[PDB]
Design a protein around this ligand. Structure first.
Ligand SMILES: [Mg+2]
Ligand SMILES: [Mg+2]
Ligand SMILES: [Mg+2]
Ligand SMILES: [Mg+2]
Ligand SMILES: [Mg+2]
Ligand SMILES: [Mg+2]
Lengths: 233, 226, 196, 211, 204, 125, 195, 222, 195, 196
């Protein structure tokens, strides 16, 4: 049993016709102190998988090292390490899920919420969630923390069920994700303007976008708001 | 509960879902959460349902007497001031969280109130367990100089987000539109996107299925003449 | 919350962020924390929003009644009324208020009233959760008898840093200028102050 | 829950109710609160159902292994003691168990009460569960050693009914067993709803209840 | 410990075609101990019927309180109170004890004598009104009753068909509740006749 | 200070008359005429707006007053006494009825409440 | 001051109440009478917290005796029980409630019927053919449910009561030092001096 | 303090027919007032004509199902590909559950299939492994809403034959698979109306001598 | 399993132990023998937490019987009491102590003397002319302090014991269902079947 | 405690106050919080004095053994050893450590290891109770590639403000300069830094 110290907020994601998109901001909070601003919370594994992590950052860095070690280990005595016997998103998730549940079962959890996004060998989209309790679930849209409450409602308007996935393009999906990140920046007190976004497509592969910013913000209406009821000036 | 308020060109609109719950159980599937403080001042309530009803009726009663005393139509700032001072005095023990909206001779107004007595001003607001789902929609689609039609659309879309995504909210959308120089129009069950499908079977029993010990006529009439 | 008031040559300026939070949720991102209790006596509020609104409303009432009987109240008098409410009800209040006002005789004055209900007259004051991160910056950069433009820059830069580090602070930077010339409201948006 | 067991001339009667509750919610109307350890041994069940099921099902393992090794059936005293010693292993750990081990061996009919504390009591009559006080009243006032098998079966049945009526957490149905030297004999499942009205009319009892 | 489940019991009400039904079990207990099988939970003031579940002392106190108030109402108004008006009176009376409430779940049932319209309503312990068109449930087996009513109920049932529906809703709900049962009563209410029926059920 | 008049100012005279009530009725007699007529589908109440001065805006002085949405009142006698009775009547319609029963009082019962207030000013100290 | 039983037979009500009073680990008294006569044909037994029991009982007694003198009339058992219930319902929401459970055994001279009312400290009233408080019912009700008839004589009621006490004496862990038994009928209240 | 347990909601229902069995469950997964997924399968085909669902805390549920599926695999390895009978599976699950008696799988488990005489079978487990064969069992969030309805409509409790007035019970006639599915759908539709954690979808697994078949139905998404 | 008394007279040791066993609010047994014979001339009575009492007693019995067989010799009462004390002193600092109080009544055949040892669950041993555990001593010791002589016969010891039990039955709140009495002397251990 | 490390053109400089407190009592007013784990790898310690001393001693041992086998360790390697101890024993440690070192290949580097045992490479780092008050000042005044004299002034001014506002900080300002030229210790007394 512990408590999280340095923490990362929401990770958000969704499926689209040819793949998956995942995003997360670049902040490492120390309680209410916005302590670290250059924290990368999306960690690619090969060219087919991106693991997005929220919660305790020290545990995130530990998981990051496990995934790095996993790639090294898979390449050992493996002539097809960059082909048929490369790591799949499903392999990476199942491993993490095993670790997460084992750690909670020893009453010493990795204090995180994780989303594994990727594309399988056969072209199938992969998107699944796991957290500190070992709880797992899949959905056309997935989000952690605040994102679950604010991003999912917006992303579900685009892909409401399985049959909406083939009708959703990468442009529409990315647009929805970017808008959700803006909404989280308006409303989550532990968020930042700077974020990373990753697209894993079955045709164009892994596109990793760094140093993105929330833009097109509405603040002008604030000038007219005065007092808390009766004040006119 | 999901409740919202949205300002527009010539007035203000409020909206709410219709699900009331006790724990995980749905007590009423078509609850009325849009309460009338005065003809053109309406409010929607989240939190303890009895408190939102009671505090609205009390201030509404005193607002009516105030209107008669002053020979003036009631103002939203008066309802706001009376609500907040009542709620502050009870130090959050009256669990009323309200969005108050209306039109009066001063213009159109939109406020929120918390149970401890703090108030806020805004062009768009949301309260309740589904407020985060609703606010996500409002933050995505709100703009300055909305028309009446656009505001009703935005408000009901925000409630829908709560209905579908928040387990504490559900069933129908109620709306009330308050426009300057017009009667307030209360639109009960403005949307009905959750009608139950027909059941597979009829469960009407044959007569005489239940075992009975005794029968008797109950005298509901008063003592009779002669 | 990040709030401050700064005296300068022509009077005083109040400054504030616009973020109110319930835990980590931003319940209002465009809050007005600069509240008017009299024509040229304003205050910055921090702590319980319910408490500081209730206090400010009572003070506004007291100063309105004072004015009807005895004419325009001094800033010291306004601070005294705030203090009386905060001190006597210290067990049941969570309020940190900065009082700022302009007289013609006294010019710009600033009084801070922390949690206990004590009063402290100062050349400038900072308060709220975000103030902790700018004690160093403000102490190094404050000068007495600054110009209006200098004081606006000082408050803009100060609250910018408070917002940058404090998660409970954010949104727009609101300001109210109190001088002989009158009352001026200023607003500064994120795209402006974040690049400072 | 209400369970009882008593010794008498031609063996031992075992009677139990069949209700299970989760707070006020009745989760089961028909749980089996007698475990057939083997054809010559029965065990009642009160407390935690899982603890009773697991540890007495395991007791049967031990009793079977005993017979294979020694070429002779295990006594009721020995069987009850093996069970009580398993409990003492997990003493203070939260096990919840209260049951009557019923059987017929060389010393005749035998009946031992065993609980989670390790307690192991030999006796002629025992009752456990939330409705045991009601069953004891009927048992104590009507019990003789000189009872016939027919009357003894009815006594155990009537005693559970008394508990099922008054105790909110007892009811559903009554399960009867009669333990002989040739083994236990099952005497059926008896719905309490139907049994109550039947007993009320025939016996004249429960006058205060309108039927 | 929980005041709303010490004594146990249930009430259910339903609307039909030109009629209403209200029903209750007869049990009063002290937690596990069954104390009385004749504790009726439905009362009437004129043609308005009130069922009350919860803490038994408050059930009795509130009945006496509403008899008191409806008798004064009648003397002053020179007419019997209507279901709609009585519902507001129950709500008002419960809310006046906001911070020291009666631990009850009241249920109103009746037919307006002037309009002929069937009426039912339910309340939480502090006065919040639930005015359902279909059915109202209350007591320690309210979850069970919701399940029964939601599947068994259909609108515009004739009085004798409504009797079967509400009876089966009560009985089977009570048989899945330890603290309910020990008998049951059903009222079938029409504009100018009311029939009361005691049901036969298991006594455990 | 303190109100030290805790005794009745209206008392029975040897002849059984309550003087102050009779004198109050005399004040009513001097007042401007007002009337009421009941029809099958309505009721009408009327009075004269006796303006004290032509410079006075007599529209601002309301002799006929709404008590509830379905109940109205008019008077003859002392105008200020009427005005405060209208204030009390409007309030009592809420406190002793609407806040209890969720509806406005019937005419006869609101009348009964106003009557009670007037009776008490005839006996109280 | 724990065990109090009641049974209503054909023509009388019988109340049985334990004799023990315990202070700490010592039994102070084994002859305590846990009862008060409220009126000539109405008897109330009681059990609950120390002190409150007698204080409440005597307070009720004083009020019924006051009523009797004022009206020159004996209140019916039903009327007395309702008065007592209201006082307890009143008391449960007081600053410090009176932790007292009672049985009221009375003979109604108007209806010529015995009546037994059971009221707990919350003000929970029920009219019963037989009743008890606390755990007393847990041991005795199965016997009463079996043997009780409404046409029982006083002597048969006493015999059934003896069986109930014997079962209590067998299966209760506490020594309650026997019971004092009193009968309420048309002729008034009398004590059975050998039980 | 770290709480190793959670509540993922969900409601499951097992009914045994004469020569068939059904195990049904809603597809909604939740924490608190949020929906995690509208379609997260909860009832699983474990091989050997056995279907299983472990409802409650989903992490423990998935772990138990995974370990039981594993136990079926090793039963084949160790005992010459012998078919694991439903009674043998039930006893095996008890030991899996009781193995964590002092740190339990926070789930209510139900399995369904056919016994060795080809008759429909359902077994029901508590979190620590007490079990029993049953005809009818609802589990999870809306279990209390569903079971009383099943008592009345499957077992005909409190139903008597008209004219006799309580003297003759309604006879317990056998139900077809089509009849059971109707009662399952109406159970979940009614539960969806009154329980906030029930909705989105209903997945039913039907077991006969021919094998395991699946049926899916939409439920209200609010 | 709460009352155990002992008295050492001229030529014997007498142990008296209550017969009751209670589970919850119900007395399960009224004939329980709270004693074990450790050797032909040594008897141990016991009282404490449920389960632990019998388990500890039987464990001690097994060990003394093992010693008896190994050496073909009966340990003196003093030696047995010291062994028992060490086991309890050992147990009090264990993970889960055995909550058991004992009286050891033995006749030393070498010295031709009766001996009574009192040992509580902490391992507090004392040799006494008479002893008890729990609250038993609070009621009985004033009688024993008054009437006891070291030259008392077995019959006089039994009479003084009857007086002690009578005082317990009068002033003690719980019902302990009488006592089983056993005598330890030169001829061994026997039970008084009428007491 | 107020501690910081700042990279500059020629390498890195570590800074610290000298106050250790037991409650409000100053148990040591001349503490050395700048601790050597290798020739040109030093650390600043905050949190439990027992824990950070124990950790630093173990690290010094590890780097001494590393050096005997594999030659001079990198600053990253030193930070990794610190992290391993802090992360794996997070339940039983209260340690906030800044690691600073000079390589010839990598030049000046700074790593901060907060309570949880995470690692963060930064151009400069601030930590300890007094750091809260200088987040604004340091963010506004830090530049990359400063001179030795500029970096000394930056740290002196920063820790001066931290000391001024934080009661748990005080005494002398100690500094250690890590460059190619070697290791230089600096000390600055109250009369010097208080007048800044
Ligand atoms: Mg064993
Ligand atoms: Mg029962
Ligand atoms: Mg919803
Ligand atoms: Mg001792
Ligand atoms: Mg330490
Ligand atoms: Mg200092």
């Amino acid at each position: 049993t512990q408590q999280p110290i340095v923490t990362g907020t929401s990770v958000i994601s969704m499926k689209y016709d040819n793949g998956v998109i995942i995003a997360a901001d670049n902040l490492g909070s120390y309680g209410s102190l916005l302590r670290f601003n250059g924290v990368e919370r999306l960690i690619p594994v090969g060219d087919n998988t991106v693991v997005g992590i929220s919660g305790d950052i020290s545990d995130m860095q530990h998981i990051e090292r496990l995934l790095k070690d996993l790639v090294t280990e898979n390449a050992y005595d493996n002539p097809l390490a960059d082909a048929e016997e490369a790591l799949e998103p499903s392999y990476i998730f199942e491993y993490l899920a095993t670790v997460m549940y084992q750690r909670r079962s020893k009453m010493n959890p990795l204090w995180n919420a994780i989303i594994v996004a990727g594309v399988q060998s056969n072209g199938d989209q992969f998107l699944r969630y796991v957290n500190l309790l070992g709880v797992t679930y899949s959905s056309p849209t997935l989000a952690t923390g605040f994102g679950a409450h604010m991003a999912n409602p917006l992303l579900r308007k685009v892909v409401d069920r399985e049959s909406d996935i083939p009708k959703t393009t990468v442009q529409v999906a990315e647009e929805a994700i970017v808008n959700a990140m803006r909404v989280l920046y308006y409303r989550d007190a532990r968020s930042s303007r700077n974020f990373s976004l990753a697209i894993i497509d079955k045709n164009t592969g892994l596109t990793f976008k760094k140093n993105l910013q929330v833009e097109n913000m509405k603040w002008d209406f604030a000038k007219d708001i005065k007092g808390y009821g009766t004040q006119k000036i | 509960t999901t409740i919202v308020g949205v300002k527009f060109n010539n007035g203000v609109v409020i909206a709410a879902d219709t699900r009331s719950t006790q724990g995980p159980i749905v007590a009423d599937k078509n609850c009325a959460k849009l309460h009338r403080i005065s003809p053109k001042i309406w409010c929607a309530g989240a939190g303890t349902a009895a408190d939102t009803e009671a505090v609205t009726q009390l201030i509404g009663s005193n607002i009516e007497l105030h209107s008669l005393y002053t020979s003036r139509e009631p103002r939203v700032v008066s309802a706001l001031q009376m609500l907040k001072q009542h709620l502050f005095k009870y130090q959050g023990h009256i669990g009323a969280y309200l969005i108050v909206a209306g039109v009066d001779p001063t213009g159109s107004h939109l406020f929120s109130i918390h149970a401890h007595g703090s108030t806020d001003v805004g062009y768009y607001l949301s309260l309740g367990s589904g407020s985060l789902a609703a606010m996500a929609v409002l933050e995505s689609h709100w703009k300055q100089d909305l028309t009446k039609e656009e505001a009703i659309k935005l408000a009901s879309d925000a409630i829908q987000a709560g209905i579908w995504n928040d387990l504490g909210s559900g069933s129908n959308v109620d709306v009330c539109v308050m426009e300057i120089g017009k009667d307030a129009e209360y639109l009960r069950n403005y949307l009905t996107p959750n009608v139950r499908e027909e059941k597979q079977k009829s469960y009407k029993f044959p007569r005489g299925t239940t075992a009975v010990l005794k029968e008797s006529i109950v005298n509901i009439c008063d003592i009779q003449e002669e | 919350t990040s709030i401050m008031a700064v005296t300068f040559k022509d009077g005083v300026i109040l400054g504030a962020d616009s973020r109110t939070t319930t835990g980590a949720y931003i319940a209002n991102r465009v809050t007005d924390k600069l509240t008017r209790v009299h024509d040229k006596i304003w205050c910055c509020r921090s702590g319980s929003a319910a408490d500081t609104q209730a206090i400010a409303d009572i003070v506004q009432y007291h100063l309105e009644l004072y004015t009807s009987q005895y004419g325009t109240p001094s800033t010291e008098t306004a601070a005294s009324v705030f203090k009386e409410l905060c001190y006597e009800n210290k067990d049941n209040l969570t309020a940190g208020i900065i009082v700022a006002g302009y007289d013609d005789k006294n010019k710009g004055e600033v009084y801070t009233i922390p949690l206990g209900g004590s009063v402290h007259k100062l050349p400038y004051a900072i308060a709220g959760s975000g103030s902790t991160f700018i004690y160093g910056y403000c102490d190094k950069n404050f000068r007495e008898n600054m110009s209006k433009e200098e004081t606006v820059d000082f408050i803009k830069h100060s609250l910018s840093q408070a917002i940058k580090w404090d998660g409970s602070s954010g949104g727009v930077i609101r300001m109210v200028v109190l001088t002989a010339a009158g009352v001026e409201r200023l607003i500064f948006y994120p795209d402006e102050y974040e690049q400072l | 829950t209400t369970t009882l067991a008593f010794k008498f001339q031609h063996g031992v009667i075992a009677a139990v109710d069949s209700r299970a509750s989760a707070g006020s919610y009745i989760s089961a109307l028909r749980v089996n609160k007698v475990i057939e350890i083997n054809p010559y041994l029965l065990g009642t069940m009160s407390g935690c159902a899982a603890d009773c099921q697991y540890w007495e099902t395991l007791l049967a393992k031990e009793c079977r292994l005993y017979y294979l090794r020694n070429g002779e059936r295990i006594s009721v005293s020995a069987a009850s003691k093996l069970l009580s010693n398993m409990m003492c292993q997990y003493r203070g750990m939260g096990l919840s168990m209260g049951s009557m081990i019923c059987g017929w061996d060389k010393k005749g009919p035998g009946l031992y009460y065993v609980d989670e504390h390790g307690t192991r009591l030999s006796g002629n009559m025992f009752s456990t569960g939330s409705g045991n006080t009601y069953a004891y009243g009927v048992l104590d006032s009507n019990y003789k050693w000189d009872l016939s098998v027919e009357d003894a079966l009815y006594l155990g049945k009537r005693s559970i009914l008394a508990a099922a009526h008054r105790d909110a957490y007892s009811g559903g149905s009554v399960n009867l067993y009669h333990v002989t030297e040739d083994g236990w004999i099952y005497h059926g499942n008896h719905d309490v709803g139907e049994l109550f009205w039947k007993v009320k009319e025939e016996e004249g009892s429960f006058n205060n209840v309108i039927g | 410990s929980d005041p709303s489940s010490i004594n146990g019991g249930i009430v259910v009400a339903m609307t039909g075609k030109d009629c209403v039904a209200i029903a209750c079990d007869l049990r009063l207990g002290s937690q596990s101990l069954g104390v009385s099988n004749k504790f009726e939970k439905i009362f009437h003031y004129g043609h308005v019927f009130l069922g009350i579940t919860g803490l038994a002392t408050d059930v009795t106190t509130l009945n006496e309180m509403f008899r008191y108030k409806t008798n004064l109402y009648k003397l002053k108004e020179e007419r019997a109170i209507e279901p709609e008006t009585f519902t507001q009176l129950v709500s008002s009376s419960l809310y006046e004890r906001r911070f020291g409430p009666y631990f009850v779940g009241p249920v109103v049932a009746g037919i307006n004598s002037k309009s002929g319209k069937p009426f039912i309503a339910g309340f939480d312990l502090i006065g919040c009104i639930d005015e359902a068109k279909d059915f109202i449930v209350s007591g320690t087996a309210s979850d069970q009753l919701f399940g029964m009513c939601e599947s068994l109920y259909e609108p515009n049932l004739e009085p004798e068909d409504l009797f079967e529906t509400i009876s089966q809703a009560l009985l089977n709900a009570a048989d899945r509740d330890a603290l309910s049962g020990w008998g049951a009563v059903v009222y079938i209410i029409k504009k100018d006749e009311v029939v009361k029926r005691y049901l036969k059920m298991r006594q455990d | 200070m303190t109100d030290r008049y805790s005794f009745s100012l209206t008392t029975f005279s040897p002849s059984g008359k309550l003087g102050q009530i009779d004198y109050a009725l005399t004040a009513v007699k001097q007042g401007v005429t007002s009337l009421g007529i009941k029809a099958t589908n309505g009721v009408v109440i009327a009075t004269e707006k006796k303006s004290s001065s032509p410079l006075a805006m007599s529209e601002t002085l309301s002799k006929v007053s709404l008590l509830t949405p379905d109940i109205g009142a008019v008077y003859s006698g002392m105008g200020p006494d009427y005005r405060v009775l209208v204030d009390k009547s409007r309030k009592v319609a809420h406190t002793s009825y609407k806040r209890i029963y969720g509806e406005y009082p019937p005419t006869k019962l609101l009348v009964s409440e106003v009557a009670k207030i007037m009776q008490e000013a005839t006996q109280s100290g | 001051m724990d065990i109090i039983l009641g049974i209503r037979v054909q023509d009388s009500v019988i109340l049985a109440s334990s004799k023990a009073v315990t202070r700490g680990i010592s039994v102070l008294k084994d002859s305590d009478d846990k009862t008060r006569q409220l009126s000539p044909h109405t008897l109330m037994s009681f059990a609950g917290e120390a002190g409150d029991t007698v204080q409440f009982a005597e307070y009720i007694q004083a009020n019924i005796q006051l009523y009797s003198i004022r009206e020159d009339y004996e209140l019916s058992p039903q009327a007395v029980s309702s008065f007592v219930r209201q006082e307890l319902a009143k008391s449960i929401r007081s600053r410090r409630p009176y932790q007292v459970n009672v049985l009221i055994g009375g003979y109604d001279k108007k209806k010529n019927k015995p009546e037994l009312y059971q009221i707990d400290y919350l003000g929970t009233k029920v009219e019963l053919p037989y009743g008890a408080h606390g755990y007393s019912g847990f041991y005795t009700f199965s016997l009463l449910d079996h043997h009780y008839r409404p046409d029982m004589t006083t002597e048969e009621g006493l015999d059934l009561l003896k069986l109930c006490v014997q079962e209590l004496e067998k299966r209760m862990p506490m020594d309650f030092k026997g019971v004092i038994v009193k009968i309420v009928d048309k002729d008034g209240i009398r004590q059975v001096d050998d039980f | 303090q770290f709480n190793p347990y959670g509540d993922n909601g969900g409601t499951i229902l097992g009914i045994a027919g004469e020569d068939f069995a059904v195990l049904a469950g809603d597809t909604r997964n939740i924490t608190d007032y949020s929906i995690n997924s509208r379609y997260e399968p909860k009832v699983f085909d474990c091989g050997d004509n056995i279907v299983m669902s472990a409802n409650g805390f989903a992490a423990d549920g998935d772990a138990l199902v995974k370990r039981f599926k594993n136990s079926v695999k090793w039963y084949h390895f160790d005992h010459n590909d012998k078919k694991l009978s439903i009674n043998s599976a039930a006893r095996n699950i008890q030991h899996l559950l009781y193995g964590k008696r002092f740190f339990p799988y926070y789930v209510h488990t139900i399995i369904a299939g056919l016994d060795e005489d080809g008759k429909g079978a359902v077994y029901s487990f508590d979190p620590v492994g007490s079990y029993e064969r049953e005809q009818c069992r609802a589990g999870g969030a809306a279990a209390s809403l569903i079971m009383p309805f099943l008592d009345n409509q499957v077992n005909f409790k409190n139903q008597y034959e008209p004219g006799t007035n309580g003297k003759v019970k309604k006879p317990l006639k056998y139900l077809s698979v089509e009849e059971v599915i109707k009662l399952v759908r109406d159970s979940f539709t009614s539960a969806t109306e009154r329980h906030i954690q029930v909705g989105d979808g209903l997945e039913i697994l039907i077991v006969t001598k021919d094998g395991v078949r699946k049926e899916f139905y939409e439920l209200k998404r609010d």
